[PDB]
Amino acid sequence: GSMSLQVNLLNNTFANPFMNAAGVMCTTTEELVAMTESASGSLVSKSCTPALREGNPTPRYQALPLGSINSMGLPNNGFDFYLAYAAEQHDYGKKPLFLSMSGLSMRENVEMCKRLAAVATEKGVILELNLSPQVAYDFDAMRQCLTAVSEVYPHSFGVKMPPYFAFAHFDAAAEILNEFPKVQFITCINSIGNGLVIDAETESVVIKPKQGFGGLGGRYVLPTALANINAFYRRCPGKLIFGCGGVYTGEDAFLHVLAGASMVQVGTALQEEGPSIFERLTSELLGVMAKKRYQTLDEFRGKVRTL
Amino acid sequence: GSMSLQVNLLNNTFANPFMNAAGVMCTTTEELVAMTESASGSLVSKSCTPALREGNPTPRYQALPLGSINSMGLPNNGFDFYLAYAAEQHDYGKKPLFLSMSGLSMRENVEMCKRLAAVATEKGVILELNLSPQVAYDFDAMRQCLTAVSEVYPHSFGVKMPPYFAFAHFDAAAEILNEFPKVQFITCINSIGNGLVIDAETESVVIKPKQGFGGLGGRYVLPTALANINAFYRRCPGKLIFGCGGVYTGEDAFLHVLAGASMVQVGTALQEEGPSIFERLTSELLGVMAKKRYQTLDEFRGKVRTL
Numbered sequence A, B: 001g002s003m004s005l006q007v008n009l010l011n012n013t014f015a016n017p018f019m020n021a022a023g024v025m026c027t028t029t030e031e032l033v034a035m036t037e038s039a040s041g042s043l044v045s046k047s048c049t050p051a052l053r054e055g056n057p058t059p060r061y062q063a064l065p066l067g068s069i070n071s072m073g074l075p076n077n078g079f080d081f082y083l084a085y086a087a088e089q090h091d092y093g094k095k096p097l098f099l100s101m102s103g104l105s106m107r108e109n110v111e112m113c114k115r116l117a118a119v120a121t122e123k124g125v126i127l128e129l130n131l132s133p134q135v136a137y138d139f140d141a142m143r144q145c146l147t148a149v150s151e152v153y154p155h156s157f158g159v160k161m162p163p164y165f166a167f168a169h170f171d172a173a174a175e176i177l178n179e180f181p182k183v184q185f186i187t188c189i190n191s192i193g194n195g196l197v198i199d200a201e202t203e204s205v206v207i208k209p210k211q212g213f214g215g216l217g218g219r220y221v222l223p224t225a226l227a228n229i230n231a232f233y234r235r236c237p238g239k240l241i242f243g244c245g246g247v248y249t250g251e252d253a254f255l256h257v258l259a260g261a262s263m264v265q266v267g268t269a270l271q272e273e274g275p276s277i278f279e280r281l282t283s284e285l286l287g288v289m290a291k292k293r294y295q296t297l298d299e300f301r302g303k304v305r306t307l
């Protein structure tokens, strides 16, 4: 019968839940256009700092059989660039736009948010604030960051979270997030931090920054991502959860949604395949839903069965 | 090509670096005997509490294409049983023995160590104290725990660590462990905590306890294990590191050792294959060493090349 990947949230309509992960194929004008032109339901711009940033020395990304490792070091074109893309260039007629922000201090985030507010009101761009020790592993730094943005930014927004690995941490993070009604979505997860890939043939690490230590993505991270999606799905019932981590197929995405995901972001798989991946993912997810006789995402979002 | 997998540490000689991971295939008398009869260089008994524990309701372990998920809940025969095995049954002639301890409180570890001391002294059993919201993720508690144990246990021991994901955490944990000369080895890592596996066919989780959340092992964890091994190798130059996580082949073990491992523990792969796996692994590591023109482990232990 009839089937739909449509999602409705944050006062927008999305043709499907798929979008890129912040930082993957969303740095340059061409990349942003290409994401807008793709079959994805949305897109998010590369996490930005106030000024242009070169990022870390190369090699700083390596694809792997089971995913990827990277230490990009936030290379990006600067806030003015992404702001201008949001203000003047993005076709909102095609799909909604998220802007990812990753200031190097609280003060940097405060300053960009003050400027973002106008473009968010007028054009409807949606902030994804990157919190992902790094800010979200320090609950005090995390509270302080959110308080500061909330104070100065007169709009809803969402937060991109590093993975946690303990229920006490799920509770502590959710408790903080729930004190901020402007945080209306939570993106789980960023990379699994600081893995170390060694190439047995060269007896060496495979990226240059940080003695070879870098964030893991891809097949490595799927169960951690599902854990985090579901953990915050349960503990933040007043908020949406966006999934990110280990999506290569419609079936993978199906798992994200079962766990509680509203949108589903694609990192490593998109890096390897390019924006055409979104045509395949939509098809595949529709195929999974057809075989299981689901017609909408609402039917099974967050309905994973426990034993 | 005269090669040796010999390891020498804590006044002991080990034929090869391989042993079981604590908790895999060593809960019962039969299992400990089979581990002693196997080709492994050593073995460690199931993490013990003061009294026997039934553990969590089943299913509580699931093997996966990329590894395993479990929430066993420390099922074990109790401290008296493993103490008795160490004191009266274990053939130290065949290989050295480690005893893993996991009291649920500092007081419980203290009282077990008081009684373990005499057996360590007399028979040579070596303690691996399991610090893996839980205690390893709380740095003040960790110091307190090690102070308490160090006060009553006049022998070298090692600690079993959960993975960390941030350089600031590597630094903080290492600084504590470096306060304690009795901590002569560090085992990296326990499982990646609280993953969530969801079976797309059944639309459900795969283990019963804790709504399907459980510790991940196997291929999922290898780069995290290598990071922690190398992280602690670097920051604790006075100690040895035992690797644990994602070892299926002699090549995996080669990577553990390059990262800095002295002993190499085998969990998931051993659960799936049984103790004969140790003949395969010794054979495969020698093959990898012959191809790379190494004769001994310390020729390349810790010698991973950075860029």
Ligand SMILES: Cc1cc2nc3c(=O)[nH]c(=O)nc-3n(C[C@H](O)[C@H](O)[C@H](O)COP(=O)(O)O)c2cc1C
Residues within 6 Å of the ligand: A021, A022, A023, A024, A046, A047, A061, A068, A070, A072, A074, A100, A102, A130, A132, A160, A189, A190, A191, A216, A217, A218, A219, A221, A244, A245, A246, A247, A265, A266, A267, A268, A269, A271
């Ligand atoms: C090359 C690269 C660049 C990334 N850049 C960012 C970023 O700028 N901001 C961010 O929040 N996450 C960033 N990430 C993390 C991804 O957004 C995503 O959280 C992670 O890769 C998990 O998704 P995957 O398993 O689909 O790769 C990056 C990941 C990669 C591989």
Ligand SMILES: Cc1cc2nc3c(=O)[nH]c(=O)nc-3n(C[C@H](O)[C@H](O)[C@H](O)COP(=O)(O)O)c2cc1C
Residues within 6 Å of the ligand: B021, B022, B023, B024, B046, B047, B061, B068, B070, B072, B074, B100, B130, B160, B189, B190, B191, B216, B217, B218, B219, B221, B244, B245, B246, B247, B265, B266, B267, B268, B269, B271
């Ligand atoms: C069924 C099972 C039981 C375990 N029991 C223990 C335990 O009692 N004590 C402990 O420190 N670690 C325990 N672990 C964790 C392993 O020691 C090891 O740290 C982890 O499985 C990663 O190694 P692997 O990737 O080789 O599985 C257990 C793991 C599994 C799968």
